[PDB]
Coordinates of C-alpha atoms and ligand atoms in Angstrom, one line a residue:
Chain A
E17 CA 87.8 -61.1 -60.2
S18 CA 85.8 -58.4 -59.3
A19 CA 88.6 -56.8 -61.4
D20 CA 87.9 -58.2 -64.7
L21 CA 83.7 -57.8 -63.8
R22 CA 84.4 -53.9 -62.9
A23 CA 86.5 -53.5 -66.6
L24 CA 83.8 -55.4 -68.8
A25 CA 81.1 -53.4 -67.2
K26 CA 82.8 -50.2 -68.0
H27 CA 83.4 -51.4 -71.3
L28 CA 79.7 -51.9 -72.2
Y29 CA 78.5 -49.2 -70.6
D30 CA 81.0 -47.1 -73.2
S31 CA 80.3 -49.1 -76.2
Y32 CA 76.3 -48.8 -75.3
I33 CA 77.0 -44.9 -75.7
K34 CA 78.9 -44.8 -78.5
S35 CA 76.6 -47.6 -80.6
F36 CA 73.6 -46.1 -79.3
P37 CA 72.8 -42.1 -80.3
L38 CA 69.5 -41.7 -77.6
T39 CA 70.6 -42.7 -74.3
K40 CA 67.9 -43.5 -71.4
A41 CA 69.5 -40.8 -69.2
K42 CA 68.4 -38.4 -72.0
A43 CA 65.5 -40.0 -73.0
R44 CA 64.3 -39.7 -69.5
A45 CA 64.9 -35.8 -69.1
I46 CA 63.3 -35.5 -72.1
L47 CA 60.0 -36.6 -70.9
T48 CA 60.5 -34.8 -68.1
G49 CA 62.3 -31.4 -68.1
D53 CA 64.7 -29.2 -72.1
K54 CA 63.8 -28.6 -75.3
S55 CA 60.0 -29.7 -75.3
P56 CA 59.2 -32.4 -78.2
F57 CA 56.2 -31.7 -80.2
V58 CA 53.4 -33.6 -78.7
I59 CA 51.7 -35.9 -81.4
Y60 CA 48.1 -36.5 -79.7
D61 CA 45.7 -36.1 -82.3
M62 CA 45.1 -36.4 -85.9
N63 CA 46.0 -33.1 -86.5
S64 CA 48.7 -32.7 -84.2
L65 CA 50.0 -35.6 -86.5
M66 CA 49.4 -34.0 -90.0
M67 CA 51.8 -31.1 -88.5
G68 CA 54.4 -33.3 -86.7
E69 CA 54.9 -34.9 -90.4
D70 CA 56.4 -31.5 -91.2
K71 CA 57.5 -30.0 -88.0
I72 CA 59.5 -33.5 -87.8
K73 CA 62.7 -34.3 -89.7
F74 CA 66.2 -34.9 -89.4
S84 CA 51.4 -43.5 -98.7
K85 CA 48.5 -45.2 -97.5
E86 CA 45.6 -44.2 -94.7
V87 CA 47.2 -42.9 -91.5
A88 CA 47.8 -46.0 -89.3
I89 CA 49.3 -47.9 -91.9
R90 CA 51.9 -45.4 -92.1
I91 CA 52.9 -45.0 -88.3
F92 CA 53.4 -48.9 -88.1
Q93 CA 55.6 -48.5 -91.7
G94 CA 57.5 -45.9 -89.6
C95 CA 58.1 -48.0 -86.9
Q96 CA 59.8 -50.3 -89.1
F97 CA 62.1 -47.9 -90.6
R98 CA 63.2 -47.1 -87.1
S99 CA 63.6 -50.9 -86.3
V100 CA 65.8 -51.6 -89.2
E101 CA 68.2 -48.5 -88.0
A102 CA 68.1 -49.6 -85.0
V103 CA 69.3 -53.1 -85.8
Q104 CA 72.4 -51.5 -87.4
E105 CA 73.0 -50.3 -83.8
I106 CA 72.7 -53.3 -81.8
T107 CA 74.7 -55.3 -84.3
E108 CA 77.6 -52.5 -83.6
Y109 CA 77.1 -53.0 -80.0
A110 CA 77.0 -57.1 -80.0
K111 CA 80.9 -57.0 -81.7
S112 CA 82.0 -54.8 -78.7
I113 CA 80.9 -57.9 -76.3
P114 CA 84.1 -59.2 -75.8
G115 CA 84.1 -62.9 -77.4
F116 CA 81.7 -62.3 -79.4
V117 CA 83.3 -61.8 -82.9
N118 CA 85.2 -65.0 -82.5
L119 CA 82.1 -67.0 -82.3
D120 CA 81.0 -68.8 -85.3
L121 CA 79.6 -66.7 -88.0
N122 CA 76.6 -68.3 -88.8
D123 CA 76.1 -68.2 -84.5
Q124 CA 76.7 -64.7 -84.2
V125 CA 74.1 -64.4 -87.0
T126 CA 71.5 -66.2 -85.4
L127 CA 71.7 -64.6 -82.1
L128 CA 71.2 -61.3 -83.7
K129 CA 68.2 -62.9 -85.9
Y130 CA 66.4 -64.1 -82.5
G131 CA 67.9 -61.3 -80.4
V132 CA 67.2 -57.9 -81.8
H133 CA 63.2 -58.2 -81.2
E134 CA 63.9 -58.5 -77.6
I135 CA 66.5 -55.7 -77.6
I136 CA 64.6 -53.3 -79.2
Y137 CA 61.3 -53.7 -76.6
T138 CA 63.6 -53.4 -73.8
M139 CA 65.2 -50.0 -75.4
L140 CA 61.6 -48.9 -76.3
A141 CA 60.8 -48.9 -72.5
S142 CA 63.8 -46.2 -72.3
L143 CA 61.8 -43.5 -74.6
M144 CA 58.5 -44.9 -72.5
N145 CA 56.3 -43.6 -70.0
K146 CA 52.7 -44.5 -68.9
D147 CA 51.5 -41.9 -71.2
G148 CA 53.1 -42.0 -74.1
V149 CA 56.5 -42.4 -76.1
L150 CA 59.4 -40.5 -78.1
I151 CA 59.6 -40.9 -81.4
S152 CA 62.3 -39.6 -84.1
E153 CA 65.4 -39.6 -82.2
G154 CA 63.3 -38.4 -79.6
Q155 CA 61.9 -34.8 -81.4
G156 CA 58.5 -36.1 -80.8
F157 CA 56.3 -37.8 -78.3
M158 CA 53.1 -39.4 -79.8
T159 CA 50.6 -40.1 -76.7
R160 CA 49.5 -43.5 -75.5
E161 CA 45.7 -42.6 -75.8
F162 CA 46.3 -41.4 -79.5
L163 CA 48.3 -44.6 -80.6
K164 CA 45.4 -46.7 -79.0
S165 CA 42.8 -45.2 -80.9
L166 CA 44.1 -46.3 -84.1
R167 CA 41.8 -48.5 -85.7
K168 CA 42.2 -52.5 -85.5
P169 CA 44.5 -53.8 -85.5
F170 CA 46.8 -50.8 -85.2
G171 CA 45.3 -49.8 -81.4
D172 CA 47.0 -53.0 -79.9
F173 CA 49.9 -52.3 -81.7
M174 CA 51.7 -50.3 -78.6
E175 CA 49.3 -51.0 -75.9
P176 CA 50.9 -54.4 -74.6
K177 CA 54.4 -52.7 -74.9
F178 CA 53.0 -49.6 -72.8
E179 CA 52.0 -52.5 -70.4
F180 CA 55.4 -53.7 -70.6
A181 CA 57.1 -50.5 -70.0
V182 CA 55.4 -49.8 -66.9
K183 CA 56.7 -52.8 -65.3
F184 CA 60.2 -52.8 -66.4
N185 CA 60.6 -49.2 -65.6
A186 CA 59.6 -49.9 -62.2
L187 CA 63.1 -51.5 -61.6
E188 CA 64.7 -47.4 -62.0
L189 CA 67.6 -49.2 -64.0
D190 CA 70.1 -46.3 -66.2
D191 CA 72.2 -47.0 -69.4
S192 CA 75.3 -48.7 -67.2
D193 CA 72.6 -51.8 -66.0
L194 CA 70.9 -51.6 -69.7
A195 CA 74.2 -51.8 -71.3
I196 CA 75.4 -55.4 -69.6
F197 CA 71.3 -56.7 -69.7
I198 CA 71.5 -56.5 -73.2
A199 CA 74.6 -58.5 -73.9
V200 CA 73.3 -61.0 -71.9
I201 CA 69.8 -61.2 -74.1
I202 CA 72.6 -61.6 -77.4
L203 CA 74.2 -64.0 -75.8
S204 CA 71.3 -66.7 -74.8
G205 CA 72.5 -69.9 -75.6
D206 CA 68.9 -71.5 -76.4
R207 CA 68.5 -69.7 -79.6
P208 CA 67.5 -72.4 -82.1
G209 CA 70.2 -73.3 -84.8
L210 CA 73.7 -72.7 -82.7
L211 CA 76.4 -74.7 -83.7
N212 CA 78.5 -74.4 -80.5
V213 CA 76.6 -73.0 -77.3
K214 CA 79.8 -73.8 -75.4
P215 CA 81.2 -70.7 -76.0
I216 CA 78.1 -68.3 -76.1
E217 CA 77.1 -69.5 -72.4
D218 CA 80.4 -69.0 -71.0
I219 CA 80.5 -65.4 -72.4
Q220 CA 76.6 -65.2 -70.8
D221 CA 77.9 -66.3 -67.5
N222 CA 80.3 -63.9 -67.4
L223 CA 78.1 -61.0 -68.4
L224 CA 75.4 -62.7 -66.0
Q225 CA 78.2 -62.2 -63.1
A226 CA 79.1 -58.6 -64.4
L227 CA 75.3 -57.5 -64.2
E228 CA 75.0 -59.0 -60.8
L229 CA 77.9 -57.4 -59.7
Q230 CA 76.7 -53.5 -61.3
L231 CA 73.3 -54.1 -59.6
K232 CA 74.0 -54.9 -56.2
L233 CA 76.8 -51.9 -56.2
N234 CA 74.9 -49.5 -58.5
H235 CA 71.5 -50.7 -56.3
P236 CA 72.3 -52.0 -53.1
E237 CA 69.1 -50.7 -51.9
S238 CA 67.0 -52.7 -54.5
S239 CA 66.7 -56.1 -53.1
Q240 CA 66.9 -59.2 -55.4
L241 CA 67.0 -56.6 -58.5
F242 CA 69.4 -59.2 -60.4
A243 CA 66.3 -61.8 -60.1
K244 CA 63.6 -59.6 -60.6
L245 CA 65.1 -58.2 -64.1
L246 CA 65.7 -61.9 -65.5
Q247 CA 62.3 -62.6 -65.0
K248 CA 61.4 -60.0 -67.4
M249 CA 63.0 -62.1 -70.1
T250 CA 59.9 -63.7 -69.7
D251 CA 57.6 -60.5 -70.7
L252 CA 60.2 -59.6 -73.4
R253 CA 59.6 -62.9 -75.1
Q254 CA 55.8 -63.0 -74.5
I255 CA 56.0 -59.3 -76.3
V256 CA 58.0 -60.3 -79.6
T257 CA 55.9 -63.4 -79.8
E258 CA 53.1 -61.7 -79.8
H259 CA 53.8 -59.0 -81.9
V260 CA 55.1 -61.7 -84.8
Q261 CA 51.2 -62.7 -84.6
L262 CA 50.2 -59.3 -85.4
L263 CA 52.4 -59.0 -88.5
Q264 CA 50.7 -62.4 -89.5
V265 CA 47.1 -60.8 -88.9
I266 CA 48.7 -57.3 -91.1
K267 CA 49.9 -59.0 -93.7
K268 CA 46.6 -59.0 -95.0
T269 CA 45.7 -55.6 -96.2
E270 CA 46.9 -53.2 -99.2
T271 CA 47.7 -55.8 -101.7
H276 CA 58.2 -50.3 -103.6
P277 CA 59.2 -53.5 -104.4
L278 CA 62.5 -52.5 -102.9
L279 CA 61.2 -51.0 -100.1
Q280 CA 59.5 -54.3 -98.9
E281 CA 62.5 -56.2 -99.3
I282 CA 64.5 -53.8 -97.4
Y283 CA 62.7 -55.3 -94.5
Chain B
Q13 CA 81.1 -66.3 -41.2
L14 CA 77.2 -67.7 -41.0
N15 CA 75.4 -65.0 -40.6
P16 CA 71.8 -64.5 -38.6
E17 CA 70.0 -63.6 -41.5
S18 CA 71.3 -65.9 -44.0
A19 CA 70.4 -68.0 -40.7
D20 CA 66.6 -67.5 -41.5
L21 CA 66.9 -68.0 -45.1
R22 CA 68.3 -71.2 -44.3
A23 CA 65.4 -71.9 -41.9
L24 CA 63.1 -70.9 -44.6
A25 CA 64.7 -73.3 -46.9
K26 CA 64.5 -76.1 -44.4
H27 CA 60.8 -75.2 -44.1
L28 CA 59.5 -75.5 -47.3
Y29 CA 61.6 -79.0 -48.2
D30 CA 59.4 -80.0 -45.4
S31 CA 56.1 -78.9 -46.4
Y32 CA 57.5 -80.2 -50.1
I33 CA 57.9 -83.8 -48.7
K34 CA 54.6 -83.5 -46.7
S35 CA 52.8 -82.3 -49.4
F36 CA 54.1 -84.3 -52.9
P37 CA 54.1 -88.4 -52.9
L38 CA 56.4 -88.2 -55.4
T39 CA 59.4 -86.5 -55.1
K40 CA 62.4 -86.3 -57.6
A41 CA 64.8 -88.6 -55.3
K42 CA 62.6 -91.7 -55.7
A43 CA 61.6 -90.6 -59.2
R44 CA 65.3 -90.6 -60.1
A45 CA 65.4 -94.0 -57.8
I46 CA 63.0 -95.7 -59.8
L47 CA 64.3 -94.8 -63.6
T48 CA 68.0 -94.9 -62.5
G49 CA 68.1 -98.8 -61.3
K50 CA 68.2 -98.2 -57.8
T51 CA 65.2 -100.6 -58.0
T52 CA 64.7 -104.3 -58.1
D53 CA 61.3 -103.7 -56.0
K54 CA 60.8 -100.1 -57.6
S55 CA 61.1 -100.6 -61.2
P56 CA 58.3 -100.0 -63.4
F57 CA 55.9 -101.8 -66.1
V58 CA 56.9 -99.8 -69.4
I59 CA 54.4 -99.2 -72.0
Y60 CA 55.6 -98.6 -75.6
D61 CA 53.0 -100.0 -77.5
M62 CA 49.7 -100.5 -78.0
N63 CA 49.6 -104.4 -76.7
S64 CA 52.2 -103.6 -73.7
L65 CA 49.4 -100.7 -72.7
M66 CA 46.9 -103.6 -72.9
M67 CA 49.2 -105.5 -70.2
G68 CA 50.0 -102.3 -68.0
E69 CA 46.4 -101.8 -66.8
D70 CA 46.3 -104.8 -64.6
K71 CA 48.5 -103.8 -61.9
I72 CA 48.2 -99.3 -62.9
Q81 CA 36.7 -92.1 -68.0
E82 CA 34.5 -94.9 -66.2
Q83 CA 34.5 -97.2 -68.9
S84 CA 36.5 -97.6 -72.7
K85 CA 36.3 -95.2 -75.8
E86 CA 40.1 -95.0 -77.5
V87 CA 43.7 -94.9 -76.6
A88 CA 44.4 -91.6 -77.0
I89 CA 41.5 -90.1 -75.1
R90 CA 41.8 -92.6 -72.0
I91 CA 45.1 -91.9 -71.7
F92 CA 44.0 -88.2 -71.8
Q93 CA 41.2 -88.7 -69.3
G94 CA 44.4 -91.0 -67.4
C95 CA 45.9 -86.8 -67.1
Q96 CA 43.1 -85.1 -66.6
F97 CA 42.7 -86.6 -63.4
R98 CA 45.7 -86.6 -62.4
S99 CA 46.6 -83.1 -62.6
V100 CA 42.9 -82.3 -60.2
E101 CA 44.9 -84.4 -57.9
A102 CA 48.6 -82.3 -58.2
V103 CA 46.4 -79.1 -57.9
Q104 CA 45.2 -80.5 -54.8
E105 CA 49.0 -81.1 -54.1
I106 CA 50.2 -77.9 -54.7
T107 CA 47.4 -76.3 -53.2
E108 CA 48.5 -77.8 -49.9
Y109 CA 52.0 -77.2 -50.5
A110 CA 50.6 -73.0 -51.2
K111 CA 49.2 -72.8 -47.9
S112 CA 52.4 -73.5 -46.2
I113 CA 54.2 -70.9 -47.7
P114 CA 54.9 -68.1 -45.4
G115 CA 52.5 -65.6 -45.9
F116 CA 50.4 -67.0 -48.9
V117 CA 47.4 -67.3 -46.6
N118 CA 47.4 -63.8 -45.2
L119 CA 47.1 -62.2 -48.7
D120 CA 44.0 -61.1 -50.2
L121 CA 41.7 -64.2 -50.8
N122 CA 40.9 -63.2 -54.4
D123 CA 45.2 -62.8 -55.1
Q124 CA 45.5 -66.2 -53.2
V125 CA 43.3 -67.9 -56.2
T126 CA 44.8 -65.8 -58.9
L127 CA 48.3 -67.0 -57.9
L128 CA 47.6 -70.4 -58.1
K129 CA 45.3 -70.5 -61.1
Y130 CA 48.3 -69.5 -63.2
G131 CA 50.6 -70.9 -61.3
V132 CA 49.6 -74.3 -60.9
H133 CA 50.9 -75.6 -64.5
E134 CA 53.9 -74.1 -64.3
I135 CA 54.8 -76.1 -61.4
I136 CA 53.2 -79.1 -62.7
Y137 CA 55.6 -79.4 -65.8
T138 CA 58.4 -78.2 -63.4
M139 CA 57.8 -81.5 -61.2
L140 CA 56.8 -83.4 -64.4
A141 CA 60.4 -83.1 -65.4
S142 CA 61.5 -85.1 -61.9
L143 CA 59.8 -88.1 -63.5
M144 CA 61.1 -87.9 -67.0
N145 CA 64.4 -88.4 -69.2
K146 CA 64.6 -88.6 -72.7
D147 CA 62.9 -91.4 -73.4
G148 CA 59.8 -91.1 -70.9
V149 CA 57.8 -90.3 -68.7
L150 CA 56.4 -91.7 -65.0
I151 CA 53.1 -92.7 -64.8
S152 CA 50.8 -94.0 -61.7
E153 CA 52.5 -93.0 -59.4
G154 CA 55.4 -94.6 -60.5
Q155 CA 54.6 -98.0 -60.9
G156 CA 54.7 -97.3 -64.9
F157 CA 56.8 -95.7 -67.6
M158 CA 54.9 -94.3 -70.6
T159 CA 57.7 -93.8 -73.5
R160 CA 58.4 -90.7 -75.9
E161 CA 57.6 -92.8 -78.7
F162 CA 54.3 -93.9 -77.8
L163 CA 52.8 -90.8 -77.0
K164 CA 54.4 -89.3 -79.6
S165 CA 52.7 -91.5 -81.7
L166 CA 48.9 -91.1 -80.8
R167 CA 46.1 -89.7 -82.7
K168 CA 47.1 -86.4 -84.4
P169 CA 45.7 -83.9 -81.9
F170 CA 47.0 -85.9 -79.1
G171 CA 50.7 -87.3 -80.6
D172 CA 51.8 -83.7 -79.9
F173 CA 50.9 -82.5 -76.2
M174 CA 53.6 -84.4 -74.6
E175 CA 56.5 -83.7 -77.1
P176 CA 57.3 -80.2 -75.8
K177 CA 57.3 -81.5 -72.1
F178 CA 60.2 -83.6 -72.9
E179 CA 62.1 -80.7 -74.8
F180 CA 61.9 -79.0 -72.1
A181 CA 62.9 -81.6 -69.7
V182 CA 66.3 -82.9 -70.7
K183 CA 67.0 -79.0 -70.9
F184 CA 65.2 -78.3 -67.3
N185 CA 66.6 -81.6 -66.0
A186 CA 69.7 -80.8 -67.2
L187 CA 70.3 -78.2 -63.9
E188 CA 70.6 -81.4 -62.2
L189 CA 67.9 -80.0 -59.0
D190 CA 67.2 -81.7 -56.0
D191 CA 64.4 -81.7 -54.1
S192 CA 65.3 -79.0 -51.6
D193 CA 66.0 -77.0 -54.3
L194 CA 62.7 -77.4 -56.3
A195 CA 60.4 -76.6 -53.0
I196 CA 61.9 -73.0 -52.9
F197 CA 61.7 -72.6 -56.6
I198 CA 58.0 -73.8 -56.5
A199 CA 57.5 -71.2 -54.2
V200 CA 58.8 -68.6 -56.3
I201 CA 56.7 -69.6 -59.1
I202 CA 53.4 -69.3 -56.9
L203 CA 54.5 -65.9 -55.5
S204 CA 54.8 -63.8 -58.5
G205 CA 53.4 -60.2 -58.9
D206 CA 53.3 -60.2 -62.4
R207 CA 50.1 -61.9 -62.0
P208 CA 46.8 -60.9 -64.1
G209 CA 44.4 -59.5 -62.1
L210 CA 46.8 -59.1 -58.7
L211 CA 44.6 -56.8 -56.4
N212 CA 47.6 -56.6 -54.0
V213 CA 51.1 -56.9 -55.7
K214 CA 53.3 -55.4 -52.8
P215 CA 52.7 -58.0 -50.6
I216 CA 53.2 -60.5 -52.9
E217 CA 56.6 -59.0 -54.1
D218 CA 58.1 -58.6 -50.7
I219 CA 57.4 -62.5 -50.3
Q220 CA 58.6 -63.3 -53.7
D221 CA 62.0 -61.2 -52.7
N222 CA 62.5 -63.5 -49.3
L223 CA 62.0 -67.0 -51.3
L224 CA 64.5 -65.4 -54.1
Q225 CA 66.7 -64.7 -51.3
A226 CA 65.9 -68.4 -50.4
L227 CA 66.8 -70.1 -53.4
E228 CA 69.4 -67.6 -53.8
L229 CA 71.4 -68.9 -51.1
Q230 CA 70.3 -72.4 -51.4
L231 CA 71.4 -72.9 -54.7
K232 CA 75.2 -71.5 -53.6
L233 CA 75.4 -73.8 -50.7
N234 CA 73.8 -76.7 -52.6
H235 CA 75.7 -76.1 -55.7
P236 CA 79.0 -74.4 -55.1
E237 CA 80.6 -75.2 -58.3
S238 CA 77.5 -74.3 -60.4
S239 CA 78.2 -71.0 -61.7
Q240 CA 75.3 -68.6 -62.3
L241 CA 72.9 -71.7 -61.6
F242 CA 70.5 -69.4 -60.0
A243 CA 69.9 -67.0 -63.2
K244 CA 69.9 -70.2 -65.0
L245 CA 67.5 -71.2 -63.2
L246 CA 65.1 -68.0 -63.5
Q247 CA 66.0 -68.1 -67.2
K248 CA 63.8 -71.3 -67.3
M249 CA 60.8 -69.4 -66.1
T250 CA 60.2 -68.4 -69.4
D251 CA 60.1 -71.9 -70.6
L252 CA 57.3 -72.6 -68.6
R253 CA 55.0 -70.4 -69.7
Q254 CA 55.8 -71.0 -73.3
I255 CA 54.7 -74.4 -72.3
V256 CA 51.8 -73.6 -70.7
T257 CA 50.2 -71.3 -73.5
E258 CA 51.1 -74.1 -76.1
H259 CA 49.4 -76.0 -74.4
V260 CA 46.4 -74.2 -73.6
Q261 CA 46.2 -73.4 -77.4
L262 CA 45.5 -77.4 -77.3
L263 CA 42.8 -77.9 -75.6
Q264 CA 40.6 -75.6 -77.4
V265 CA 41.2 -78.0 -80.3
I266 CA 40.5 -80.6 -78.5
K267 CA 37.5 -78.8 -77.3
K268 CA 36.5 -78.9 -81.2
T269 CA 37.7 -82.0 -82.0
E270 CA 36.3 -84.1 -79.3
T271 CA 33.1 -83.0 -78.6
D272 CA 31.7 -85.8 -76.6
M273 CA 34.6 -85.5 -74.2
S274 CA 34.5 -83.8 -70.8
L275 CA 36.9 -82.0 -68.7
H276 CA 36.9 -81.8 -64.7
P277 CA 35.6 -78.3 -63.9
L278 CA 38.4 -77.4 -61.4
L279 CA 40.8 -77.6 -64.6
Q280 CA 37.8 -75.8 -66.5
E281 CA 38.4 -72.8 -64.2
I282 CA 41.9 -72.2 -63.8
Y283 CA 42.2 -72.6 -68.0
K284 CA 39.6 -70.0 -68.3
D285 CA 40.7 -66.3 -69.1
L286 CA 44.3 -67.4 -69.4
Ligands
S44_301 C1 57.8 -47.6 -82.2 C2 57.2 -48.9 -81.6 C3 57.8 -50.3 -81.7 C4 58.3 -50.2 -82.4 C5 59.3 -52.1 -82.6 C6 59.0 -52.3 -83.9 C7 57.0 -52.0 -84.5 C8 57.2 -52.6 -86.1 C9 59.1 -53.7 -84.2 O1 58.8 -54.6 -83.7 O2 60.4 -53.9 -84.7 C10 59.3 -49.2 -83.0 C11 59.2 -48.1 -82.7 C12 60.1 -46.8 -83.3 N1 59.3 -46.4 -84.1 C13 59.2 -44.7 -84.1 O3 59.6 -44.2 -83.1 C14 58.6 -44.0 -84.8 C15 59.3 -42.9 -85.5 C16 58.8 -42.2 -86.9 C17 57.2 -42.1 -86.9 C18 56.1 -41.6 -87.6 C19 55.6 -42.5 -88.9 C20 54.7 -41.5 -90.0 C21 53.7 -40.9 -89.1 C22 54.5 -39.8 -88.1 C23 55.3 -38.8 -88.5 C24 56.3 -39.8 -89.4 C25 55.6 -40.2 -90.4 C26 57.4 -40.4 -88.3 C27 55.0 -40.8 -87.3 C28 56.4 -43.6 -86.1 C29 57.2 -44.0 -85.2
S44_302 C1 50.9 -86.3 -68.4 C2 51.3 -85.2 -69.3 C3 50.8 -84.0 -69.1 C4 49.9 -83.9 -67.3 C5 49.3 -82.5 -67.2 C6 47.8 -82.9 -67.9 C7 47.7 -82.4 -69.8 C8 46.1 -82.6 -70.1 C9 46.8 -81.5 -67.3 O1 47.0 -79.9 -67.5 O2 46.3 -82.3 -66.9 C10 50.1 -85.2 -66.4 C11 50.1 -85.9 -66.5 C12 50.1 -87.1 -65.8 N1 49.8 -88.4 -66.1 C13 49.9 -89.6 -65.3 O3 50.5 -89.9 -64.6 C14 49.1 -90.7 -65.9 C15 48.1 -91.5 -64.8 C16 47.9 -92.7 -65.5 C17 47.7 -92.8 -66.9 C18 47.1 -93.8 -67.8 C19 47.8 -95.0 -68.6 C20 47.3 -96.0 -69.3 C21 46.8 -97.1 -67.8 C22 45.2 -96.4 -67.3 C23 45.0 -95.9 -68.6 C24 45.3 -94.9 -69.1 C25 46.2 -95.9 -69.9 C26 46.2 -93.9 -68.7 C27 46.3 -95.1 -66.4 C28 48.6 -92.1 -68.0 C29 49.2 -91.0 -67.5

């Protein structure tokens, strides 16, 4: 038993590395110490960032839209990772679609915590770092955008999880048999149970000193959903401003 | 091999179950007994409509107004007593009274409703809910048909209850779970979070051990229980966002102050 669990864990860790360009081991190195990224902290710090950073309206509207693009991009990565989760591509296609539809938002904020610290967040592959203070200073309602997520990251990162821990954790979120619309819950839940097992063992072997880390992590799914519904409400409010057709479509 | 560490956990579990029974009149076992027929002397008077409601009053505000509202006032008062019960239970939690007093308040302020709906599930089944200490049973349809802004206060509850009840938790599981809920460090305002987490940690140790010993054949029941914690939060939020409406549609309807303080700033 412990066998198959280790296997499943290494499997997910590796798939996680293949599907996600910027791991947490890297985001953390960057945030601390080596090719220092371009700190964006000022309006004029931003303009210089537009050029020094690379592979319409005001400015706050351009940053939020910038997050949109990254989101859609990330969604594909998450989708490719998901297919790696043993048993996933065997489920009914409608359910795979459903699980992804309701699971990506929770996964984006989970991984976003990987690129955040109490003072800011890494943007564009980690080339930059827009400070928390600056983001907060964006004219309403855009200065309530990242503040909530920052409070989440502080708490989530306090668990000190690593890529091998998150790899499994992300899978659990995807295999959530509670998504509205599912046609066949049995298989999904069965997989989640098995994933919950792998994550439990992964935590007691990796963080033997962390008492009940497993329990504290599960408790965070609450925070995630708070974040997600709150973010969805922001989108409603916003959906009232400067009102390409193909772009709006892509989102 | 019973270990001395797991010996304390077991002890912690017996302790909490005891205060749970001592603090709450209507346990799940009794509620269960009443609902499933281990009755002849325990059967409730069922309310599934207006005349039935009229007739139920006898054995089961300070005057009268409207149904939907008389029922609402009903629940309001009932929860004032539950808060009192939970507060009584809280104090029994090893370490809860030692905490800062401000945090004591914080914990209860947010914890009271997650626990009420957790326990309210014990008195429900897909078809309705027990009331008046179990002497009565109000059907899901009667409630869901109440006047516009009210015929929607309960539906989400049943929704969660049939799902939650599916885990098949019994009173000795719930006492520990309820303690976990109260001792949650991630509550707004908490001055001292560390002490609150060392306690909750222990409780979770108790619960994980309790569930494995009590439901050996139920795979990952622990984790499945914890996930439910998010359903409660939404139940609460969804709820709060319903009082506000009552607070606008029904201006002549008062609210017990206590409840007005718990809901305040949430
Ligand atoms: C962040 C914060 C939250 C989210 C979640 C998103 C928010 C819509 C979501 O809910 O899906 C995604 C990112 C990811 N976004 C970025 O990493 C990001 C990348 C580039 C920018 C730009 C946008 C403008 C201005 C500036 C220079 C250039 C052009 C890139 C920053 C902003 C954010
Ligand atoms: C239910 C649903 C939600 C809540 C929580 C409430 C929601 C506002 C709360 O936060 O207080 C409590 C109960 C618990 N309610 C009762 O136990 C209850 C008690 C008495 C009555 C009635 C039933 C008949 C007869 C008599 C008057 C009137 C009509 C209400 C007692 C109804 C419910």
